[PDB]
Amino acid sequence: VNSFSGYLKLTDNVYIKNADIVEEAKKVKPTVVVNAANVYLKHGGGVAGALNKATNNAMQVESDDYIATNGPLKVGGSCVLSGHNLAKHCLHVVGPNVNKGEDIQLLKSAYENFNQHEVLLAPLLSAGIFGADPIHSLRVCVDTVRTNVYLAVFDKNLYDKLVSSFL
Ligand SMILES: Cc1c(O)cccc1C(=O)O
């Protein structure tokens, strides 16, 4: 049993809810919250901007030190950093950004990072401002992630469409 509440069960391991990921993290304090980051860990907008704002910019300060030491992530890659006030850990995962022309096949590689963690609170990778079709992102998630993932979808009209269209 875990603390996640109000989710619809899609599969053995994937759950979904219409929720603001920031508000969900603040309530649950999950072991892992996933950030939809860019390779530079520049948390300017969408999930990354909202998460970073909720940490009072501490996420960005930590991320700048990570990049200064290690250089940029790979598209499809990840790093584990602090969850600050939101979670124990933040898994920063880089899905491909369609609005930059990145290979959508890298979305499966991005979701494979989730398999290193038993339970996660996450957004749909590569969707929203990254340009991908969220229906596609949910299908890749279900077909890639084997660990227990609790998906938070901010957009109400999109949540209802993801559920209604789910195969
Ligand atoms: C996945 C997504 C969209 O495709 C569009 C707007 C918000 C979101 C979100 O849940 O963050």
Q: Where are the domains of the chain?
A: 1-167
CA of 19 to the centre of ligand 1 (A): 10
> Is any atom of ligand 1 closer than 6 Å to the C-beta of 22?
no
Instruction: Give the atom of ligand 1 at the shortest distance from the alpha carbon of 159.
Output: 10
Query: What distance in Å separates the CA atoms of residue 31 and residue 76, rounded to the nearest whole number?
Result: 22
Resolution for this experimental structure (Å):
1.0
Q: Across the strands, what pairs with 130?
A: none
Nearby residues of 36 by Cβ (< 8 Å), 6 or more positions away: 46, 47, 48, 93, 95, 123, 125, 126, 128, 130
Nearby residues of 67 by Cβ (< 8 Å), 6 or more positions away: 40, 41
Residue nearest to atom 10 of ligand 1 (CA): 153
CA of 128 to the centre of ligand 1 (A): 4
> Which of 155, 156, 160, 162 has the most ligand 1 atoms within 8 A of CB, as the residue to mutate?
155
Instruction: Output Rg (C-alpha) for the chain, integer angstroms.
Output: 15
- Residue 139 gets which letter from DSSP? H
Pairing of strands 8-9, 32-36: unpaired
Pairing of strands 14-18, 89-93: unpaired
Query: What distance in Å separates the CA atoms of residue 128 and residue 46, rounded to the nearest whole number?
Result: 7
Query: What distance in Å separates the CA atoms of residue 61 and residue 143, rounded to the nearest whole number?
Result: 34
CA of 125 to the centre of ligand 1 (A): 9
CB 159 within 8 A of CB 18: yes
Experimental method: X-ray
> Is any atom of ligand 1 closer than 6 Å to the C-beta of 96?
no
Residue 137's alpha-carbon distances to 74, 128, 156, in angstroms, are 19, 10, 17
CB 46 within 8 A of CB 97: no
Angle, helices 156-164/134-144, rounded to nearest 10 degrees: 60
Query: What distance in Å separates the CA atoms of residue 163 and residue 73, rounded to the nearest whole number?
Result: 32
Burial 23-54 (b: 16+ CB within 10 A, else e): ebbeebebbbbbbbbbbebbbeebbbbbbbeb
Residue nearest to atom 2 of ligand 1 (CA): 128
- Per DSSP, the three-state class of 63 is helix
